[PDB]
Ligand binder design. Sequence first.
Ligand SMILES: *[C@@H]1O[C@H](CO)[C@@H](O[C@@H]2O[C@H](CO)[C@@H](O[C@@H]3O[C@H](CO[C@H]4O[C@H](CO)[C@@H](O)[C@H](O)[C@@H]4O)[C@@H](O)[C@H](O)[C@@H]3O)[C@H](O)[C@H]2NC(C)=O)[C@H](O)[C@H]1NC(C)=O
Ligand SMILES: *[C@@H]1O[C@H](CO)[C@@H](O[C@@H]2O[C@H](CO)[C@@H](O)[C@H](O)[C@H]2NC(C)=O)[C@H](O)[C@H]1NC(C)=O
Ligand code: NAG
Lengths: 49, 49
Amino acid sequence: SNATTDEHGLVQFSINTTNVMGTSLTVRVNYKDRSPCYGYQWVSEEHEE
Amino acid sequence: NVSVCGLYTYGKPVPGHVTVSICRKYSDASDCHGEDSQAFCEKFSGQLN
Ligand SMILES: *[C@@H]1O[C@H](CO)[C@@H](O[C@@H]2O[C@H](CO)[C@@H](O[C@@H]3O[C@H](CO[C@H]4O[C@H](CO)[C@@H](O)[C@H](O)[C@@H]4O)[C@@H](O)[C@H](O)[C@@H]3O)[C@H](O)[C@H]2NC(C)=O)[C@H](O)[C@H]1NC(C)=O
Ligand SMILES: *[C@@H]1O[C@H](CO)[C@@H](O[C@@H]2O[C@H](CO)[C@@H](O)[C@H](O)[C@H]2NC(C)=O)[C@H](O)[C@H]1NC(C)=O
Ligand SMILES: *[C@@H]1O[C@H](CO)[C@@H](O)[C@H](O)[C@H]1NC(C)=O
């Protein structure tokens, strides 16, 4: 599920509880990866998730 | 020391406003869709005698 950053760059949300046990939650944003110039290059914009 | 001339027949030179350069660089792994892969430059100007 996508959403947009409200004032002061922020987003609150909730999710449905019906699975196994350990629940992994990651959040990606503007530029989900670094496809152009990768593997071969030596310097890049390593932005955190 | 570096020099540049211009002739054609019987060594008759021709006069002109030369604009020589000497750009130089390191490795070539930043061009994989990455601008400014070619490192810093150097340039000169003058007239031919
Ligand atoms: C972020 O997530 C959003 C939701 O997954 C994406 O927005 C789009 O939201 C609409 C509606 O929920 C999806 O459906 C389209 O609707 C239009 C028009 O239908 C409208 O009218 C009926 C009336 O009965 C109403 O019930 C509907 O809810 C609508 O308001 C149709 O013409 C389309 O064919 C389509 O069915 C979109 O599918 C959805 N987009 C996507 C890509 O899933 C939003 O795009 C997401 N953000 C990004 C950046 O992708
Ligand atoms: C080429 O560059 C050198 C300077 O780097 C000029 O000077 C000569 O330097 C050497 C040093 O071992 C001397 O033996 C020469 O005698 C110097 N030249 C003269 C004219 O005495 C050299 O002149 C430059 N040549 C040109 C054609 O510009
Ligand atoms: C969400 O949780 C509600 C709890 O009332 C449940 O009835 C519903 O089926 C769940 N839906 C999904 C898609 O998990």
